[PDB]
Design a protein around this ligand. Structure first.
Ligand SMILES: CC1(C)[C@H](Nc2c(C(N)=O)cnn3cc(-c4ccccc4)cc23)CC[C@]1(C)N
Length: 271
């Protein structure tokens, strides 16, 4: 929960910057691999942004949320970094593309259900994620996924249900009025269901398809297209039941969107 900087051996970059270090106190190259995050931008707003990320992760205890391992300790105030666990399989985006052939619909549904239970837990703690996408979900093992990237995550105050702060994961209210809530996370979840059932194929990615349907500023056009009720199409060979759930996640009004708690049993019955 307090890692010495001198023992954090740099290996490569993954992602503020997210690095792959080995926590090697012995200095022998046998220590555990860790995911270490730090901001390149110095400042009082940046320090607050990164302090907020740490406090959020430190109090999150789900099997479906990337494990916080601790904070760094080195020479100077500038040396402090966030230490999380490393998942060798990497992001679900790459994993889906590398292993298509062995990932069937029940498997995609098992991941969908786990992401959901994880999103359900985040709402429980009053946490809006703001960056829910396959690129931000990590593979723990064959039948296990975790939610990561808490850099844009905001905690909702006790007396409010929303927060005022790629465009293809944003809800219509986020696009027009920069309103973020658990209801906007659900919209992003529908795009995640879509990404999963497309195996994160680049040629039918939310971007490639929405831009195709699009053709004034690009954001306004997308928002016009969404206002009209146009949506991403059902992924090639997507079970119809799965596509209906995405269309509920994509309800124009936030009150109409199902809750994560409500979506959970639906994805479980589907397997
Ligand atoms: C927030 C992430 C999901 C990444 N962070 C990662 C974390 C973490 N704690 O945030 C943990 N394990 N991990 C493994 C990979 C990885 C990818 C490909 C290949 C191998 C390994 C990337 C990450 C950095 C940037 C990201 C992708 N948006």
């Amino acid at each position: 929960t307090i890692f010495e900087e001198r023992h954090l051996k740099y290996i490569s970059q993954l992602g503020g910057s997210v690095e792959l270090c080995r926590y090697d106190p012995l200095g022998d190259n046998t220590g555990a691999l860790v995911a270490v995050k730090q901001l390149q931008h110095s400042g009082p707003d940046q320090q607050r942004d990164f302090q907020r990320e740490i406090q959020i992760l430190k109090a999150l205890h789900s099997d479906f949320i990337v494990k916080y391992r601790g904070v760094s300790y080195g020479p100077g105030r500038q040396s402090l970094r966030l230490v999380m666990e490393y998942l060798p399989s990497g992001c679900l985006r790459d994993f889906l593309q590398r292993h298509r052939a062995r990932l069937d619909a029940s498997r995609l549904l098992l991941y969908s259900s786990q992401i959901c239970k994880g999103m359900e837990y985040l709402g429980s703690r009053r946490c809006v994620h703001r960056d829910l996408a396959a690129r931000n979900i990590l593979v723990e093992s064959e039948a296990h996924v975790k939610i990561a990237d808490f850099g844009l995550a905001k905690l909702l105050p006790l007396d409010k249900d929303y927060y005022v702060v790629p465009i293809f994961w944003y809800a219509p209210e986020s696009l027009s009025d920069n309103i973020f809530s658990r209801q906007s996370d659900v919209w992003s979840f529908g795009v995640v269901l879509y990404e999963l059932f497309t195996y994160c194929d680049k040629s039918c990615s939310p971007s490639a398809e929405f831009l195709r349907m699009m053709g004034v500023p690009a954001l306004s056009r997308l928002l016009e297209l969404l206002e009209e009720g146009q949506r991403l199409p059902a992924p090639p060979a997507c079970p119809a039941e799965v596509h209906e759930l995405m269309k509920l996640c994509w309800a124009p009004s936030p009150q109409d969107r199902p809750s994560f708690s409500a979506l959970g049993p639906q994805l479980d019955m589907l397997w």
